[PDB]
Nucleic acid binder design. Structure first.
Lengths: 95, 50, 82, 100, 88, 123, 205, 129, 80, 85
RNA sequence: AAGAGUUUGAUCAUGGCUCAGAUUGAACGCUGGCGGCAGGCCUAACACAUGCAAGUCGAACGGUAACAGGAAGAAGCUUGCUUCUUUGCUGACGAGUGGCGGACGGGUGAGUAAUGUCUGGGAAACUGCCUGAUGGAGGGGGAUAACUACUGGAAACGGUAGCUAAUACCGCAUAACGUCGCAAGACCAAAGAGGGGGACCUUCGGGCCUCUUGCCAUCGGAUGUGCCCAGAUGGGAUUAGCUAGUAGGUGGGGUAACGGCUCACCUAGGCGACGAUCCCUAGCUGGUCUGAGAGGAUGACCAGCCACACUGGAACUGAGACACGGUCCAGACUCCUACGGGAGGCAGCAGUGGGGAAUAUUGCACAAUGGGCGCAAGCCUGAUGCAGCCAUGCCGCGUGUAUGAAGAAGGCCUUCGGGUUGUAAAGUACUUUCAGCGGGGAGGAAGGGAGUAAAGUUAAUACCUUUGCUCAUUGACGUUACCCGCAGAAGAAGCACCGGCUAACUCCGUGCCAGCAGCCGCGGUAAUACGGAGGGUGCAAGCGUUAAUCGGAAUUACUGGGCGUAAAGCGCACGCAGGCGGUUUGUUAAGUCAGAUGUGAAAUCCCCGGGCUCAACCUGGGAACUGCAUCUGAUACUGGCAAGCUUGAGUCUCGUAGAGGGGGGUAGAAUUCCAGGUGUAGCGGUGAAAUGCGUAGAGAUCUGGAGGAAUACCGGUGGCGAAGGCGGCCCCCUGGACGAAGACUGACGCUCAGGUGCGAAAGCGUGGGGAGCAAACAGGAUUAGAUACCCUGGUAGUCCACGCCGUAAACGAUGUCGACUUGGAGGUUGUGCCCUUGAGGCGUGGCUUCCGGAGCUAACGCGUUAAGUCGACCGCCUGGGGAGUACGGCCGCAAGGUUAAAACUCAAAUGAAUUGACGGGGGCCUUGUACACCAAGGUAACCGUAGGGGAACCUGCGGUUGG
């Protein structure tokens, strides 16, 4: 949308499902993706696999925006905090 | 001896966000500690530190 | 009226009498002013059958005190014995 | 009648009226039978948390001795004046005069 | 709470001599003054309860001192309770 | 238990409880024997046990153990009852007097023969 | 009430002999002994501390032919008398007129003596006394009534009286039959093994 | 102490004895002197001595037999709360006379045989044994 | 001067008479404590010469009224 | 009912009528004195007293009234008179 | 002088229960010989047939119905034998009058909670008979019952008319030593009868003499009664106020007497938390039982006092009564009736019915001892003495003794030999208590009667009194005790028990039945436990069972108890009365102590004797009655009073810390919505979905608003507060705490029922407030069904102002205050000394944490912050359940709270710890409730409060370790 290759990835890491927004330095969202409903729902959520796949979903939701450096501002603790951070950053992003 | 205005010798007793380091690792005679907390909370409300 | 009568104590068929200064009006062996001796009608020979203590009887008689006939006859017998 | 330490931050937005507001309260204190034992300023320092939508504040601390009452109107004015959003005063418990 | 100068002055008037802060009349005098100050400052709070405890303490101790005065020496008590105005 | 406490309200004697309360300090009491049944003892024992229901001359209705290896009572017979409980279901606190009013000594008994109202065989 | 039953068996239970089948045939020759008088006498006699107090006391009662009401009365007297209760009791049992008639010889056994006493053949201090439990007192002269001096049994009960060792505390005369209770006897010359404190313990509770 | 200064002294004695204190101490009063005098003159304790005037104290010196206290049991009897007075013919013989009972008679504080000799009773201060 | 109990005036409010508390210190029969026991007792004084708190001697006499059989002897202390 | 009780009953009633007559006559004399007093008349009252006196004094003598009673009337009436004097 | 059994796998506890002991006014079962001595309706103070329980006196009186004598008469005519009449002429006496008695003695225990009793005092009194003293005792009258004549009424009971006596009554005289009165004065009484008789008189009756006895007055005595006071003598506070002749006064009156006793007036007291008043129970005491004792329980018999006499009133008469066998009236009963009207009261003795588990003769005698009357003789006496009935108790005695075996028959057990019953029997010789029969035979009987001298006295003799001696005589019991004789062992033994406690055991029978049982428990093929047998044990004219009391039980703990976990410390404070009080002097003498004196009835009990054949029993003398009172003395102690002292407590000064409390606004963390964009497929969740959101722009982003919950970190084994409890910062107000010392007061303290105040959270009520909650409530699915669990919303409430609640696992499950007593470590704060560095080193304070010694403890544990050692005061507890419930009171807006039973019901409940079994919290070692012999487990244990709900369950806010 802006091709600034900068911004923050507000990881809304809740216990059940994280909806990580991709917002730039200005404070306007670029793309949004989530773990649940985006391919799986159940009590068997809240797992590092769910956080990881949510991270890849949020990454690929904004891989078309020319963004390759997203800082992490996580809101609240979530399962697989290490997993989601790893999956998001491994897409080619800088904290 | 220790008061609120001595901003220099307060950074050693705090963190970036303004969280009181416990005396379990410093040693503050447990009277200077109440004065420490008093002064640093004042400074928070004095808006020098968060 | 004050009288010097006998009060029948003892067991059955073995009377023992207490010589007693009393008011005429009380039960034979009921309330009494004073005891002045005793009488054993069925006493043994060595056994003492009468004791009177006659100074008190003289005292009370001087104050106007009738005697029963038994105590009167008993007093006469003790005087005779001397 | 004992030492206080009037401590307040004057904002750059409100730095327009530093001498006026200051000397006004010094005159009010002296007229309220209060003598000023010290006076210093720490310049326009920075605020760690941007309280009241600003980052600078000319920290002036006046530190007069006041009785129990003559402080009440001053803090009332501080609350009623936008020159300082939040003013703090301190009891002494001792005899301290020098600033640092 | 009561000013030290007031304690010393009451010692002067309601004391036989100087530095007799232990005199019974001095004790009851300063205690009654403290009770009066508490009564004066009572209207403002009334909500306060932990402050009231010391006031009851002061009232009772004052009455104990007055009772001792009356017991030991009737004249001192029956003069003080007027020149101090107490025992109303 | 302070002495000044005791002086203000002394030590009281508790009262002897009710052990044979249907008898007002009487060795025995007559009764009319309303119903005669056969109860059942407590758990460890067996052998259903003959007991009668009796109305005493002092008003009480109580339960009384007809004992002995023999029994002849009826539905209104007049009997004498005395103290002595049975380890039975609750409330058999009285024992019928064997052989005293409308009650007979057990049959053919020859030992403890006064504890059942049976007379000495002339031999 | 006087015990009227087999005499030998009564003393088989007590273990030792009691002088109540008294005469010539020398019991254990006159009748089996050393055996408790039952169908189950052969049983081991191991008996508690109560069993032995009871046995010894019961043997004292059987020596003298005294029943339990008078025996406990003798005990209440000894306990009220002055001195140890044991000897006071045993002296009371000894001054009893049936016993002393036995002891003076005339009277072959204590029930023989009791029979004579009760049958108005004994004078105490020259007057007839027929009560068995009559407590004889020191210096009393106990004598056969002369209407009953010529009794075959009294003459016979006198020969077999020196085989019994002569009691010391009393001086019987044999030719003219009469004695004299000189003095209350003493624990030592009450010649027996009476373990009297077993009794004074039985009644001390 | 506060209301019974005499059981004070008995308690100090038996405390210091059971804890093997050489010499107990307390403030002095002439009746405390009297019981101390009685005890040492008949010897349940050794010696005592009073020092000072405004606030005298009583430097009583305990008495050990081998390592044991000479005083086995020392009891208050006439506490405030039950003042115990005995007449002379009903004076209490303490432990077969082996222990004293220091009584307060009209002729001064003195012991039990003392009174039964002088023939008068009084108030029992304290059994000693 | 027969026996002359000695006690305190507790009310002179009737004409020519007082109530007098005689205070006696008797042991407790069973607990052996010495308790204060008090005897209020109407006395006659014809001169009304007693006031609350006096200490008086009183002696027994013939009945002066109902309730009233003791008479004043001396006022041993004129309490004020 | 016993025979001597029957006689006591008839004797009691005779004595009661006799006594009632004598007491009513005596009370008449006493009342005359009392009613001379309240009239305030000294000499009338003294004469009435002198007429009452042997009457109450002989009634007491024969046991109709106790000697203490007669004395009381005489004392009380003498008082009333000497006050009224 | 302080048993046994009885809660466990086992144990140490706490703690109740059950039996062991003694006892009884006992009862009941079986059995039963004699005697002695006692006791004998404890229930219906229920109703009472019948007899008896109070009379006496002729020496007070008129009499004279009776009987008996006379004296006659008249007769019959026996020589006057006996028949009528007459005569109170005499003994005597029925009814009557009169006196005394009937107020005692006898019964009962309803009422009475204190003026009743007991202890000790008092003053204002009277007291028949008895007694001492002094005096008197004159002279008259009128009645009246009886009786006589009538005459009602069924009867009870009367009425009229006449008649009459007295020691009946009534004047009159007399009249102090009496009463009234200051005194002067006034006033006030009485009765004769009997015996004898000289002289004398005699109206022949008597007078007269003398003795006896009575009468009257006064004053004493003695006795009895009345009255007063103090203390002591049940329970209930689910009785706290009660009192108006009530409290006092002054005066009348009244009483034998003081007094409100009463009245008029006056005054306004009086009583009460030291328990008034009210309700319940109750006769009290000596004493009795029990107990080591304290104490408890009692109050039958005996004795003292009280009260009562069908119920409720009233008095009369009398010395005495408000009268058990008197009166009246009012009842309710029963009886009698002529239906008009009458009668009666067994809590006398006996007896009846009744009731009851249960308690006796419708006896004999006044012989004795008392009592009444009488001069006496005597009479009366259901008092009393006795007898009867009843093992009801206590005591004593008997039912034989010695011998003997073939150790019999026979019974039972037999391992088949025998054993055992068992010297037991029989047979032998002997005894003959008591029972039976016959003969004798005390003592309880002293007296009274008749006769016999003193000048007794005096008409000397008489009469009477007294001693004088002689004679005759009196016993209900009673054919007494006791002794003598006579037969003949002759007439005389039972009941419980036998597994352990607990002395004593085998066989059959039965078969968890029948049954037993104080406890343990026994019985389903032996079962020494149940029934029978044999054998034994125990006690024995009794033996068992029941009931009740006390002890055991120190299990109401004054002696002599507990409250951390067994029941039990108030939720916390302040504090009234109360309880208690540092030290030195003076004084008092209250308590205390000592001495003296008085008293504490007798009996009982205890000691030492004596009498009963003995014993019981009876008895003498002592001791004891531990008490109460008074007086004299001491002064140590406590108390009072007086004076002090500074250590207790406090005041001041100076500092120290702290979420101590109240005020106000105070900024942000986070909070949701809105304000918009940024964004389009998701937001959403559980056992699983789902319900619900959104694509109409959701989630998140920054931008700004809100409002409120909490001020994260600090933070703590930290701190503070009396407890609940207290956490931003600033300031104001304020409390408390401590350190330093000083100055001063000068015991001014501690603890406190009742009381007052504060008191989690819930709640409630009053209005706001609501960003989220979150009981209730509403969507989905549950699960064996779901109103499980659960996810979605969601009110009240949560928040604020005010008020009411008054509660909690309000917990250290440890009341307050003071004092003393080995340690160690830690933290918390002051502050002194000396390093004058800031700490430093050495202290010294307070606070607090963890060990740990002694000490304590059931053990765990506590252990100088006690759960040790003590003191003071308070609160509290007494097996479990019922039940912190009912009822009552009180409180609250109600909700409810607070105080707090009882019936009924069990034989246990309970605490600590231990062995190890599940040990799904670890590396041979770790563990738990419960458990055994299921604290990691479809979702802690509770307490408070509020909801939903048939419910116990769940769920909210708060809190606990009893995990």
């Amino acid at each position: 949308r802006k091709q600034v290759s900068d911004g923050v990835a507000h990881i809304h890491a809740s216990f059940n499902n994280t909806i990580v927004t991709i917002t730039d330095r200005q404070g306007n969202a670029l793309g949004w993706a989530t773990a649940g409903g985006s391919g799986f729902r159940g009590s068997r959520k809240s797992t590092p696999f769910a956080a990881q796949v949510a991270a890849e979903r949020c990454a690929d939701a904004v891989k078309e925006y020319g963004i390759k450096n997203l800082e992490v501002m996580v809101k609240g603790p979530g399962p697989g905090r290490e997993s989601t951070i790893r999956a998001l950053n491994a897409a080619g992003f800088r904290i | 001896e220790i008061d609120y205005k001595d901003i220099a010798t307060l950074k050693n007793y705090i963190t970036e966000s303004g969280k009181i380091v416990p005396s379990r690792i410093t040693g503050t005679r447990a009277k200077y500690q109440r004065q420490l907390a008093r002064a640093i909370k004042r400074a928070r409300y004095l808006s020098l530190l968060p | 009226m004050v009288t010097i009568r006998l009060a029948r104590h003892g067991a059955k068929k073995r009377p023992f009498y207490q010589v007693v200064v009393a008011d005429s009006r009380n039960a034979r062996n009921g309330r009494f002013i004073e005891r002045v001796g005793f009488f054993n009608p069925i006493a043994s020979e060595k056994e003492e059958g009468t004791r009177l203590d006659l100074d008190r009887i003289a005292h009370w008689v001087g104050q106007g005190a009738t005697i029963s006939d038994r105590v009167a006859a008993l007093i006469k017998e003790v005087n005779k014995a001397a | 009648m004992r030492h206080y330490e009037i401590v307040f931050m004057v904002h750059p937005d409100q730095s327009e009226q530093v001498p006026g507001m200051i000397e006004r309260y010094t005159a009010a204190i002296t007229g309220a039978e209060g003598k000023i034992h010290r006076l210093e300023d720490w310049g326009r320092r920075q605020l760690a948390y941007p309280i009241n939508k600003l980052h600078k504040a000319h920290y002036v601390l006046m530190n007069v001795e006041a009785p129990q009452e003559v402080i009440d109107e001053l803090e009332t004015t501080f609350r009623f004046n936008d020159a300082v959003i939040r003013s703090m005063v301190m009891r002494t418990k001792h005899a301290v005069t020098e600033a640092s | 709470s009561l000013s030290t100068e007031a304690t010393a002055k009451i010692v002067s008037e309601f004391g036989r001599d100087a530095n007799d802060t232990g005199s019974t009349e001095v004790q009851v005098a300063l205690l009654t003054a403290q009770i009066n100050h508490l009564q004066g400052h009572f209207a403002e709070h009334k909500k306060d309860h932990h402050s009231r405890r010391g006031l009851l303490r002061m009232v009772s101790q004052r009455r104990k001192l007055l009772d001792y005065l009356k017991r030991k020496d009737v004249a001192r008590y029956t003069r003080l309770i007027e020149r101090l105005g107490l025992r109303r | 238990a302070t002495v000044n406490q005791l002086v203000r309200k002394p030590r009281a004697r508790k009262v002897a409880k009710s052990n044979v309360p249907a008898l007002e300090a009487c060795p025995q009491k007559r009764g009319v024997c309303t119903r005669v049944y056969t109860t059942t003892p407590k758990k460890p024992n067996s052998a259903l046990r003959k007991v009668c229901r009796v109305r005493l001359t002092n008003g009480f209705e109580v339960t009384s153990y007809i004992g002995g290896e023999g029994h002849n009572l009826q539905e209104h017979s007049v009997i004498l009852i005395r103290g002595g409980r049975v380890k039975d279901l609750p409330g058999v606190r009285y024992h019928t007097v064997r052989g005293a009013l409308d009650c007979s000594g057990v049959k053919d008994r020859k030992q403890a023969r006064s504890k059942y109202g049976v007379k000495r065989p002339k031999a | 009430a006087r015990y009227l039953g087999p005499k030998l068996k009564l003393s088989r239970r007590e273990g030792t002999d009691l002088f109540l089948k008294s005469g010539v045939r020398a019991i254990d020759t006159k009748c089996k002994i050393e055996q408790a008088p039952g169908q189950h006498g052969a049983r081991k006699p191991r008996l508690s501390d109560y069993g032995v107090q009871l046995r010894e006391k019961q043997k004292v009662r059987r020596i003298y032919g005294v029943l339990e009401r008078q025996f406990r009365n003798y005990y209440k007297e000894a306990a009220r008398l002055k001195g140890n209760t044991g000897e006071n009791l045993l002296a009371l049992l000894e001054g009893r007129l049936d016993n002393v008639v036995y002891r003076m010889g005339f009277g072959a056994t204590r029930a023989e003596a009791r029979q004579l006493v009760s049958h108005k053949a004994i004078m105490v201090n020259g007057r007839v006394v027929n009560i068995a439990s009559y407590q004889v007192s020191p210096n009393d002269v106990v004598s056969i009534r002369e209407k009953a001096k010529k009794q075959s049994r009294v003459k016979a009960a006198l020969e077999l009286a020196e085989q019994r060792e002569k009691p010391t505390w009393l001086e019987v005369d044999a030719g003219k039959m009469e004695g004299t209770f000189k003095r209350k006897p003493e624990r030592s010359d009450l010649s027996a093994d009476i373990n009297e404190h077993l009794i004074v313990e039985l009644y001390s509770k | 102490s506060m209301q019974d200064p005499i059981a004070d002294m008995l308690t100090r004695i038996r405390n210091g004895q059971a804890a093997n204190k050489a010499a107990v101490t307390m403030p002095s009063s002439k009746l405390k002197v009297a019981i101390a005098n009685v005890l040492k003159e008949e010897g349940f304790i050794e010696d005592f001595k009073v020092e000072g005037d405004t606030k005298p104290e009583l430097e009583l010196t305990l008495k050990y037999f081998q390592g044991k206290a000479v005083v086995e049991s020392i009891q208050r009897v006439s506490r405030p709360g039950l003042r115990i007075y005995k007449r002379k013919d009903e004076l209490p013989k303490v432990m077969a006379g082996l222990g004293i009972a220091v009584v307060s008679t009209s002729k001064g504080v003195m012991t039990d045989r003392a009174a039964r000799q002088a023939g008068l009773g009084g108030e029992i201060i304290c059994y000693v044994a | 001067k027969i026996r002359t109990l000695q006690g305190r005036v507790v009310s002179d409010k009737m004409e020519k008479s007082i109530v007098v508390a005689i205070e006696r210190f008797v042991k407790h029969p069973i607990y052996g404590k010495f308790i204060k026991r008090t005897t209020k007792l109407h006395v006659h004084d014809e001169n009304n010469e007693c006031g609350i708190g006096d200490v008086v001697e009183i002696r027994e006499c013939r009945p002066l009224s109902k309730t009233k059989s003791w008479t004043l002897v001396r006022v041993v202390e004129k309490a004020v | 009912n016993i025979k001597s009780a029957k006689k006591r009953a008839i004797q009691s009633e005779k004595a009661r009528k006799h006594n009632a007559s004598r007491r009513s006559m005596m009370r008449t004399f006493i009342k005359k004195v009392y009613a001379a007093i309240e009239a305030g008349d000294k000499a009338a009252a003294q004469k009435a007293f002198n007429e009452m006196q042997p009457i109450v004094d002989r009634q007491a003598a024969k046991g109709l009234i106790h000697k203490n009673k007669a004395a009381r009337h005489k004392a009380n009436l003498t008082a009333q008179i000497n006050k009224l004097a």
